[model samples]
Target: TVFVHQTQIPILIERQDNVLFYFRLDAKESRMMDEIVLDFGKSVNLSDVQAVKLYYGGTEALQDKGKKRFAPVDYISSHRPGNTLAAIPSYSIKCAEALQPSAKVVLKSHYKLFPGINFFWISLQMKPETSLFTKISSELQSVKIDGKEAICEERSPKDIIHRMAVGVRHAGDDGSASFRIPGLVTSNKGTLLGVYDVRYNSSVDLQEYVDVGLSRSTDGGKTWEKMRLPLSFGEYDGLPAAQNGVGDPSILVDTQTNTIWVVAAWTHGMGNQRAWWSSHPGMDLYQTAQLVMAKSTDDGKTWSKPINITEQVKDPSWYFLLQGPGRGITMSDGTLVFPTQFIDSTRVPNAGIMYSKDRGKTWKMHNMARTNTTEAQVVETEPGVLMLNMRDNRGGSRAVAITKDLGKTWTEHPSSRKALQEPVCMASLIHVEAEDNVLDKDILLFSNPNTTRGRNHITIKASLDDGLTWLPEHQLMLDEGEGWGYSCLTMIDRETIGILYESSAAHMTFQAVKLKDLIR
Candidate 1:
């Protein structure tokens, strides 16, 4: 059964900012980081309220990061006989009346309109900041929603729904007990492989002891094999494994040679140590990380030791360089590519791609993808056309660029920084061939939190014209919680799409969705 929440709290309505608002008891210690949106029209009678019971969709932050209902009485300056209730807004006081001791009156009317947006209502709270009303929700003057909405039950599954990490603090090993950063791919033999960060010490960054962990599913993702660390160390420069961190894996399947490659970043527990912030000064090597790679020949069951290609891809003057940590794609012409990032000599982050023309024998780097972007993913739109969709550190939307000559030259996509908005978090993108009668043409799918604020609402969008426009009608929000969202997606089959993402209150959640359910 899918996860469900059944909790109760007091409900009350208040009028503020010219809008009548309702809030249930906030059981959380501090305010929620995310906000729920409600669209209203006309006005409210103040005395009447439409209490819609809400449920919680699950999500967990990066390891670190509701009220009482009070009835309003009309008297304007009235007092309950020998009782005490806090003062409410003027509108509520104007339509004041006693709420039935055990309220059961349904304020029935027209329901909200969701012609193309069948929103999953199992989601909560107003933004308390002064400049928030205009940004967080629909206009405050619309006061009442006029129509009542119904409770939604979420049972979205696509043949596979196996939860990774078996249980609490689980990673199937003693070194790094917890897992993060999911990189999934389908090997030639149809084997499903996943690579993630084994956050052993804590859910911190590369500073804490971490390992590049692996899991595989022989059948579809109905079940997964035990965990294995393909790349790890405590012996780098003679430091403990806890000191030397190796994580953030991006996996790619070479359909041409049937070879699987996983690339990641390795911080040796020395120097500037920050993965993207500052690398070793002047190639100081001590304080920076080098780009690392591992090979799995037996369809992800076993992995070779890591090979560091830092000298080839990273320049001494730059602060850092590493493969984008999630999924990569092989172009139609047999060229292998992985989305890549580098901090230039000026210490500015840029997104690019790494390519190996002659199979996996050698590598090369290009840093001109974008000016201020990081944590990106790549996909091949056509024969030699590659697009890099990245997180823009300088602002809210995604920084996009396309390279026709294997990153030799770059061009800003029409929707670059204009198409997708994120909370400065990593996202996933994939290209799929047409299946059955689904679509005669190829399409792309992108997944990330679909919001301008913090990462909370995880959504999947489709692009039929390669990476052009994303139709709002062809999108779906899988998770709408306050938890930080970090996710990865893989096409399961012609009809199925699988995802491994940050689930509320859980480390990571995996799901498989149908193409029909996503692309209308």
Candidate 2:
């Protein structure tokens, strides 16, 4: 039997420049519970001039001296309160009368529990008044299961905050985890893989590089082990060099050659530079950013020298900031398909594809996938059919494209009816073998901030009939107050899938879970 756990939260006020919101209740600190429920309410007007809407749920931790592994629980937003107004922004009137005279609006909800898992919730309220808006603000509140408040923190428009937080009932263990990017592979052995960045630092400074690690599962993702990457910024060959200094590493294992291929980019020497302000001084001194490849022949035991693929494809006019290969899938005819992206001359949309037939010896460029898109991933559905899913650079929506003859040809890009917002990054897609007289077609997609409202919501959805129909399988992480990072996923087996992603919390740690358990 599938046990369902969901939650909802509401808004209090909606103003012209910003909106005020709140989360009702958080989970009771426990480990036996699997999911939490959120109750969303309508918008409420605080005073004669202030108004707001409900964002989502929030969480808190109970202070206990006995438990040593206490951590946060999983919570999903079940339903959003019905919209009230058509013309003016409608606010929920439920909390309007109950708020104190000085109180703007108070949003509330309840929590549930299971034997080994518990549910927790947090909400982030965003208010945008003008089209030329400059800042975004949020109020975060955490409440325990017994209706006790633990902590309330408010973030300004620019504060660096982790979007999602997971807690253990006991202390000292990594409480929360999130998705970093999605990953997949192609092989005769039917093995699939996904890689996550797992950043430990969220500072805007480049000097504070995020610690990245690797995780893989053999039996179609039923279980996983934390694989280690070479030291960041370390020696290669005999030169004083550094590894692909940044953490977001994507891998493709070639079963035929028994070589595991990994591609990642790093900030040259300006680790201390501010991302938005600094003009990457190391771009001229060192290859500021380049896509490097490493191969492992014996089931990831050891890796070979780093091959710089960017130098061969770099454009003099545009400095390449980010470049890397996507999931590597072998065609029915043994053609190696590797999807890659780079900052072009325009520097607006930095994405493309690369095809190699001689197993990374030589590569041919095919800029077939482009539409103001970046950070794209590719998957092979059949011998001649391929699906390319990408983070949209255009302001409208997320997109996907089809290639019939490998990467040689392409079709018009199609916008995913599935909800996806801005700041698109790493994601993964895999084909599931059909069963039970099914149409012999299935696809699974993992993405972050699956809602149009915010980027903190991470969800996994499955397409039963190819990519045409979809069912929301589960909500992995939903902490609106924290910022979510890239994510990766792989199918380990029919009943299990593995996922690894970065969290918005303080320490960067990779997280994994069983697909069947998450779907439940």
Candidate 3:
């Protein structure tokens, strides 16, 4: 008789050298064990596996820790058949020597796992036909061996349930060193347009050879079109491309005319100088950061040259001005609004809105909504009423305000700081409307790290009655690890919500979650 241990499993594993399974065996069962088999589910083909190894480890540690050596175990022969007769794609490893049952052990594997999630099966093969394996009860159930409850540590075998796909990364194409700041939007044609800073030299902010890059997904974010420079300043006025970089893009799509607009901050003549500090109080390109924009009339198929709007919007006394880096929105009255930030003459950062009533003809900038606030997201909470949710520099929670007269005046929101807790990172918020009879009322969706400590626990929370209360059950954690913590959200369809954010696993990751999952 053969037995295996049972333990909790992980839904996702990003590391390449990860433990497939961990199990402990009794002294008696170790003597009868001949071979072990692993079914890596259908998504993982046995033919793609490079090698598999067994290691002797300790029970206290998951793999190896605290000077404990994960010694390798020699196997007589390893069998990885292309396809099993039972139609289960699996691998078999026959041990050459008996294992020390007194110690815990782990199995490690290396292979190229395809983009989505996956599942697995671990079994103790006693004979050719009969064996003790993991039983799927949503995850795994405990299996008994010789009346002893052996806890099988299935560990994290890829569960291909949720859709998590890394879209823009440093590894693919002639990619950049780092891709930071996400701005995502769904066009009228149902195409997904994602924008980011193609930080070519380093992951630092502007004042480098960075470009406002775009990734268009025509197939609901499943795949992307080739990378395009929606906004790139190439060696302007004798300055090299690195010195004339433009980044931190905020995208928007006007439903009235189907025009997609991307606004960014262009820093000129400051080679490797951060625009946040080096930019002085002047409207000239060399004196301060300039507000620039690019537009696409054909649903992100092509983009126009950069249009400088610093003279029209930014004041000459301000230090620096930039488009708030996630996304913009179109109001009910055909007014195009982009969240904006500016450092005042006193070098104090403030967040507000930049609006255009004539459909991109002429733009106007607003005053500081709140003090010590930087990046922000703007949502038209109701017809002719807009809410600006800001990233407060105070470090624990967000600052919020409301504007009914197009940012002429502001009022503090009731749930401004007390309702949402943040780690002072950029966030995404949108008002998703419910379909007639398909749902009851409109809902508000907010995406951030969901913490006040660090940039981890990326989550999306829903509010049924506007931006007042966020229920516990409506919160969904997308990632529980630390990252750059910038995210952008868009409605993939009436039934789905699409998010493109910086994740621990990749430079940029895209996930499409069901709309029902958020409300239910």
Candidate 4:
């Protein structure tokens, strides 16, 4: 099937998250400018509403064009919930495009909802040049037939293709069997760099002919360029990519220098043979699984030779250390830090970070952010403050810590286990620059199965307060079925977010949501 879900009315599955208010203005009847007020449903709590904003962007073909912003609420909703009410602006918008068979208006809300509230992304369209009227009432929703009417219109391929499975397995390959571990980073030039493991044999870690495969999307993520093997191995001390596969891809881009890095683990021809569980920094790089890395300076078109930074950053006293799967961050101080984790000699897992301050020249390591933690994602929550939101293996809860001194020490986040949840699976956390919050602070975006049970209900959440809290209204479930729960998030643009995750039908699936679609 085309997308696993489909529907009309902008209320269909996989299309709109949970539409509260939606309508389209006809360019034919509307003038050059217009202001609109939607009922937004009584489900909304005026007290819980932090802000109301409308995002407008258009697509020419399968690519996004410039998007402008309008404030229905600059940072506060002008909503009055005392009784059934009329539109505040009480009218239709001028210059609502005549999209017709060609265009649709996509609307989204981004905020933490009050405990029992829900939200959705709504886009409505109709044939061009038609007068439209949609009435609102607390007790009724009805439409009257007119001489000519606008109905739900067909969405273009651009609207439909954001979250479909796209890569890792291709034609003409030996056992392109299981493609897993997805990582995405949008370069400075708007190029989408996606990395994953191309496991040729069994899906198990190490000792498989695995390679770090790179896929690029020069035009936002609608289409991707051919795949490139940025990290490959062959007979390193009698090892081969045929036997010593690579896994656990973590990607990062230093936008200031236009350099992109894809980091992973290499078995060095040793499946589980290497004494990685008991190895440390003093050990030769070949003695334990290596922290292998690849870099691209001219966009992801080409990459430098793989370099092992294990010795430089990992202490010989530790058992094993490698780049924790997912992505990394470039701090305001130009420190390139990748979230990292390791196993102690006793086989206990601990999570931390690795950094390169001089533009990848040298490296340093941070103390473990949290014990009993595993895979992690690092983001600069503020100019000098960094947050490492980690996978707490102790339970389904998330373990978080913050460091102002570059991971020298960590303080458990206020929310810690009490806030976010996981099924002991890797989770993604990023401090998103709020698109319309004139209040101006980072809004944290997180994605995972979002449950303490199994890997189902893939949900993405927005924390308007930047990791302090994740409200109920701001959650969007991309997939609601069973699947492995690995994920990565990247901003497609100023107002849009893109996620590539593991889903039931697609080993790796991509979903694009507007910033407005996320915040309450």
Query: What RMSD value applies to candidate 3?
Result: 9.7
The predicted structure with the larger lDDT, 2 or 3, is 3
lDDT of 2 by residue, 1-520 (tens): 1112122111211212112222222233532222222222221322222223322222323463234221232222111112111112222222122222223234343323343322222233223221111112222323333444344332323222112111100011121122233344433354444444433333232223433344444544323455555325544333333221454456776646756777666545544554222223233435456456667665664567666666565554554544342356555566666666555555455555666778777666655476567676776676677777777755535567788865566774434634444445455565554551133335555555555545554555555455665555544442333444455555544554444443332122223344554444
Q: Highest TM-score: give the candidate number.
A: 3
Candidate 1 TM-score versus the reference: 0.69
TM-score of each: 0.69, 0.57, 0.76, 0.67
Cα misplacement distance, residue 276 of candidate 4 (Å): 7.0
Please give the ranking of all candidate structures by TM-score, highest first, separated by commas: 3, 1, 4, 2
Query: What tens-digit string does per-residue lDDT give for candidate 1 at 210-272?
Result: 888787877566556777878887667787776678888899998897788999888876532
Better of 1 and 3 by TM-score: 3
The prediction achieving the highest lDDT against the true structure is 3
Model 3, residue 2: displacement in angstroms? 18
Please report the TM-score between candidate 3 and the true structure. 0.76
lDDT of 4 by residue, 1-520 (tens): 0001121111111211112233222233322212222332432122222223332322122122122111122111111221111112322222222121111122222222222111112232211221111111111122112222223332322122112223223322334655678898889888988888876665555567778887788766656677788998865667555656677889999968989988888766444443344344445645667788989999889999988887787766666778889898888888898999888766778998888889887888868887778899988877888888888888788888888988898988898887998899988887766443432556888899978999987888888776777888888776665667898988877877878777643455665676775663
Report residue 444 deviation for candidate 2 (angstroms). Answer: 4.1
Q: After superposition, how far is residue 109 of candidate 1 from its true place, in Å?
A: 29
| Model 1 accuracy (lDDT, Cα) | 0.61
Backbone atom clashes (below 3 Å) for every candidate: 23, 80, 8, 16
Clashing pairs in 3: 5-151, 5-152, 6-151, 6-152, 117-160, 118-158, 118-159, 118-160
Off by over 4 Å in 1: 1-177, 271-278, 282-287, 435-438
User: How do the residues 1-520 of candidate 3 rate in per-residue lDDT, one tens digit apiece?
Assistant: 1123322211111212223334443333222222343333332122223233333331223333333222122111111121111112123232222222111223332222222211122322111111111111222333333333444544334342222344344323354677888999999999999999988877889899989899998888766788989998887898898989899999999989999999999999766777788899988986888899999999998999889999999889999999899999999889999999999999999999999998897899867799899999999878899999999998678888999987889999988988899999998999876562135569888999889988987888988877889999898776765678999989987877888888754567777777776776
